[PDB]
């Protein structure tokens, strides 16, 4: 009849709604601790007087090791620094005579103070005098051989750890079931090796969406998340790490890049300079998340009540 | 009760379908923000030829973080070496060079010390430390704040966000115009809510915080991006929503944000450095947000906790 | 029969739901924060090496961050490798040991990368042939970690931490000092899990020692500490009541966090013309800020809510009961 019929409802939509979805599973929080070391040297050399040797102590920004590194790929250097009068960029004035530029800093994009003197930029144009950083200004100009285009092969270890808040389960990348590979030499895939957290940057920048080509040229952002899904329904093992390369690019703009700009100020026979550098590079974000969940008596009593009260 | 019952049970159930969203799955998000300066300070100190502070200099780290500091004062000790020199005064005072309990001190700690104690001319004496020499004197700090500039200078949030689980991703900086009129907008909160580029002194302003009292002295400065959109619509109703904070409400003047730093220099084979103490403004940009698409799951838990809601008003009815 | 069942059901009913509103707490709507939390560090730490000379190590020196974030690092062991010149040096036995000429050609190697070969061999040591490199040239880094930790005395340090906190969704704020601020008792607390529960952490080696991690051997090599505070308080009380709550963490099982926290880092200087470059191999203990809480208030559709969640014992206490 009408109560026969409902009873068999009841049961298949409770069955989806608390014996499918969870639901008997007390979800907890995590704490995450990721550190990352990298591995690989980039002498490129350069088209000047002897090559350049970028080791892991140059590349790697954030020297403490971040979560997010702003390893380098690429850069353009002006030497020798110092504050003093030179000609500006002709960026801000073309002028060609004194009265072209007035003093004081300008009220828009200015490299320094000018005192106001149409002086000569060489390059067969003519600009005025400005205080600042000025034994040359800064041309800005990517270059097309990617100059530290070497770290595509540069590798990455990205060893995670799990504490949970309240579960007292401590769980890490590195589960160690087959002692470091016993000869260590591996290299994550999606498929053929998704326990290696030893991704290296080429596959990390492809599997991205992006062309690590365009990527060592000019800047970029990619993202890598690690999430965690234990269900402690089973043994304590079983619940690993899943990463996912983001992207953040899809199409966008095309590739707007990311670049930043850091100097090395040193000493001289008296005076202070500074070396300027642009730097483009490749910017890793590593975000952890996890859901975890165990039995517990009272969110069984919960769901033993909603599942009869939604009757 | 029937009638009564059934007219309250659809009522109160339809609150908590329509209004709650309980029909609505919601989902997290993973964000991205990348924040540009511009804008150069030159503080040229009387008595002296000027100096600049272009944003490789006021910008702590380079790189940009999430949470990075902007130099609106300092105070430098220039040419500090590790040698035999006398105490800051306020580590003791001699009257006789009967020693200053030589070796590193269990209270104020800046060098070891020797036990003979020399001149600080300061009208006083203190005693000789090996350490960093010549001592920092921060005792006063300029006033009025030596990168007044950076009340002016832009800040530009650049905030790309996806939500996972519906492979939508959004950026802040919205695609709707080109260049002369995406590149000549100011934040404002409610002449230009979506322009991504801040003024300095107007993020301090809007946080509540006086930015003459918070160059000099330094201050924390909180700003959050909340993408609170749902998928029903179209995405392009999906944007997101600045607001500035001013952290702890400021105390009531609050000591402000300053640190050390060091530029580490060699001279004729000599290690030397350059001591700074810096008065910043620290900002802190997180991200957050909620959105969600219909989807069957959440309409059948809905309409099974809504049935079973009437069945309880009968039941009490019945009583 | 029928009555006595009802009224069962009805006790039972009323005694689930108000054991599950005493337990289930839902009567709160629990919101978010936003956390802001500076770390001051107080210590000096000199260091005595083989020479006339001793070294002091100022808070602008072992705090690596300087401006200050989340996780920063307060290095407790280094080993230098002073004035690299990046020429023509031997390369490290570790790469390679040659024998008569075994340069293979520049190319980098395959697996040691230590600058660019030259098909020369010429070493420093009793192994007197390690082929001839480009590269960063006083000496290759022979580094092997001091046994006495050289900034062991940063046991002693202080980590005042000042977190600040808000609850957008109720418009309160709270801060990591608690009450009664400033008055006495000027700068003389030390944080103690039991005796001194409210006052910011300090003391780096009861820090380290409150996560048994034995700081003598973190001093040396040691690596990740995590710190955890949860404010964990409802606003239906009075809002002194809500307080920080700190948990130290490890986040090891003694597996392969045994070699710690390590990073390179350079000072670059110039003499004469001529760039040089100060590495240093930094052995620091890394710590971690973790913020996280819910607030809570009463209001009123969260009541509704609960009224509507409790219909869960009252949904088929009646169906239930003509079954049996
Ligand atoms: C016991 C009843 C009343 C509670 C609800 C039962 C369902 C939701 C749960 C509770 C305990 C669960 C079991 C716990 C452990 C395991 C071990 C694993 O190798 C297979 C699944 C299995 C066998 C689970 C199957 C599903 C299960 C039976
Ligand atoms: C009659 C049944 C299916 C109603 C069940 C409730 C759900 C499915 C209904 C209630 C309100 C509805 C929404 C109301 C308004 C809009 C905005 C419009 O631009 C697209 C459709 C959309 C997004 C509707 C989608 C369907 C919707 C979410
Ligand atoms: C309205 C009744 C019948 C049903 C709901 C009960 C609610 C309103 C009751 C149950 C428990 C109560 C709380 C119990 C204890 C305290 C601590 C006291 O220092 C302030 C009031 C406060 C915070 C009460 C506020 C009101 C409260 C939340």
């Not at 000019?218 to 079983?238: E, F, M, P, Q």
Request: overall charge neutral; hydrophobic content about 40%; charged content about 20%.
């Amino acid at each position: 009849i009408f109560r026969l019929i409902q009873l068999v409802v009841l049961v298949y939509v409770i069955g989806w709604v608390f014996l499918y979805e969870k639901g008997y599973q007390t979800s907890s929080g995590l704490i995450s601790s990721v550190s990352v070391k990298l591995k690989g040297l980039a002498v490129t050399q350069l088209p000047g007087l002897g090559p350049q040797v970028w080791d892991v102590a140059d590349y790697v920004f954030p020297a403490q090791g971040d979560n997010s590194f702003v390893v380098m790929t690429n850069f353009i250097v002006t030497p020798k620094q110092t504050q003093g009068y030179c000609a500006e960029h002709p960026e801000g004035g073309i002028c060609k005579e004194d009265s072209g530029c007035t003093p004081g800093k300008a009220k828009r994009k200015a490299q320094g103070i000018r005192t106001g003197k149409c002086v000569a930029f060489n390059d067969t144009v003519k600009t005025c005098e400005i205080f600042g950083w000025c034994p040359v200004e800064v041309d800005d100009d990517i270059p097309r051989p990617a100059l530290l285009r070497e770290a595509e092969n540069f590798t990455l270890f990205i060893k995670n750890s799990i504490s949970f808040p309240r579960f007292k389960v401590n769980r890490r990348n590195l589960v160690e079931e087959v002692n470091a590979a016993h000869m260590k030499t591996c290299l994550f895939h999606k498929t053929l090796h998704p326990l290696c957290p030893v991704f290296q940057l080429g596959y990390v920048v492809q599997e991205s969406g992006q062309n690590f080509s365009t990527l060592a040229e000019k800047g970029g952002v990619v993202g890598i998340t690690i999430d965690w899904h234990c269900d402690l329904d089973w043994h304590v093992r079983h619940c690993r790490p899943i990463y996912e390369f983001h992207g953040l690019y899809e199409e966008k703009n095309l590739s707007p890049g990311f670049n930043f700009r850091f100097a090395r100020h040193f000493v001289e026979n008296g005076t202070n300079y500074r070396h300027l550098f642009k730097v483009f590079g490749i910017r890793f974000d590593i975000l952890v998340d996890g859901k975890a969940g165990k039995f517990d008596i009272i969110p069984t009593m919960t769901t033993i009540g909603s599942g009869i009260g939604i009757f």
